[PDB]
Ligand binder design. Structure first.
Ligand code: ZN
Length: 375
């Protein structure tokens, strides 16, 4: 039983431009073969008839509240949410307490993650010691310990020279800087556009990759677009749960390919990111709504959960290439269900989709060839 066949499914791997009725053979935690009609001895068989089989989703924006606020959420609860929403890899932000600005906390997160055993949690480092804004953190030790990106998420880097130093370091190391999330002059209405343009200008001058974690306006999207054409390494994301100057422009942004990836900004709160919502477990049905309304294809939808986020944080995931690890998500685009006390795996409930009928549900999740979630 070292061997798994996913039979009868419809496979989509945008990374390989692969779409069709194929089977998948998994040997030794890894994709061994994709082909029609696979049958081998000593193999578990999953019948994926009527299902869609794709790479495991990757969320590059999750607040796991661990260490510190583990009553809102913790590495285990988030891990469980993640795999139930189709995610085999998640990237946690560093506004923990203590913040992730030293390798002791990096290590705590990696060790906890290995023990829960469900999805692969990749930590991020703070840009500044303390997330305080003044003193730039040790990106070399933090990346070495396992951090895949840096961000001050929950108090964005105001000082424009701090941001410039961060992107220079980032470019040496080969990792993204993530800017502009709010969570736990002054507030101009166009602060966002000015910030994105600043990050663009410093990105071009430094060679550094900047990832915008929140865009709200058409002008913002046009600015991001302008710098992509100019060859600058800038990316951005959007929360599929949030799409239910304009919300209308974001949809246009997803249509036109300006927005690189989906990311939940999963943001557990215990009263009810404004102040932000949980997302992991509903990301897919939300994003399928756009697909049912003809705004994106399924290929594009899956692109934006798999290969595209993978390329931003530079890991070799989000594919079903032969040899890659067998992170596989298997979902039914047409299964109706309800997020409520019966189904919720978060310690928090803070989402406007609570109680709503959702359409699209993950049936299996597989990490490294093992079943880590089953409906
Ligand atoms: Zn955030």
């Amino acid at each position: 039983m070292l061997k798994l066949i996913v039979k009868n499914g419809y496979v989509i791997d945008p990374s390989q431009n692969l779409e069709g009725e194929f089977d998948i053979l998994v040997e030794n935690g890894k994709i061994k073969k994709i082909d029609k009609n696979i049958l081998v001895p000593e193999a578990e068989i999953i019948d994926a008839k009527g299902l869609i089989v794709c790479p495991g989703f990757i969320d590059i924006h999750v607040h796991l509240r661990d260490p510190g606020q583990t009553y809102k959420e913790d590495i285990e609860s988030g891990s469980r949410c993640a795999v139930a929403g189709g995610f085999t890899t998640i990237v946690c932000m560093p506004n923990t307490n203590p913040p992730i600005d030293n390798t002791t906390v990096v290590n705590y997160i990696l060790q906890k993650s290995k023990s829960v055993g469900l999805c692969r949690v990749l930590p991020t480092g703070t840009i500044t010691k303390g997330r305080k804004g003044k003193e730039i953190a040790d990106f070399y030790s933090l990346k070495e310990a396992g951090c895949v990106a840096f961000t001050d998420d929950g108090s964005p880097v105001m000082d424009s020279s701090v941001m410039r130093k961060a992107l220079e370091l980032a470019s040496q190391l080969g990792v993204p800087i993530m800017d502009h999330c709010e969570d736990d002059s002054s507030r101009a209405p166009e602060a966002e556009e000015i910030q994105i343009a600043r990050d663009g200008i410093l990105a071009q001058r430094t060679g550094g990759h900047v990832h915008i974690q929140h865009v709200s306006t058409k002008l913002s999207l046009e600015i991001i677009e302008f710098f992509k054409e100019k060859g600058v390494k800038i990316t951005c994301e959007v929360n599929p749960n949030h799409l239910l100057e304009d919300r209308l422009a974001l949809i246009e942004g997803v249509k036109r390919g300006i927005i690189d990836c989906f990311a939940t900004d999963h943001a557990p709160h215990q009263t009810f990111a404004m102040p932000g919502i949980i997302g992991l477990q509903t990301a897919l049905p939300s994003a399928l709504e756009l697909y049912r309304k003809g705004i994106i294809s399924l290929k594009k939808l899956i692109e934006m959960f798999t290969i595209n986020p993978a390329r931003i944080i530079g890991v070799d995931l989000g594919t079903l290439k032969l040899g890659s690890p067998a992170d596989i998500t298997i979902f039914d685009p047409n299964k109706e269900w309800i997020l409520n006390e019966e189904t919720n795996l978060s310690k928090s409930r803070n989402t406007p989709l609570w109680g709503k009928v959702l359409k699209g549900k993950v049936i299996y999740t597989i990490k490294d060839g093992k079943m880590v979630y089953k409906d």
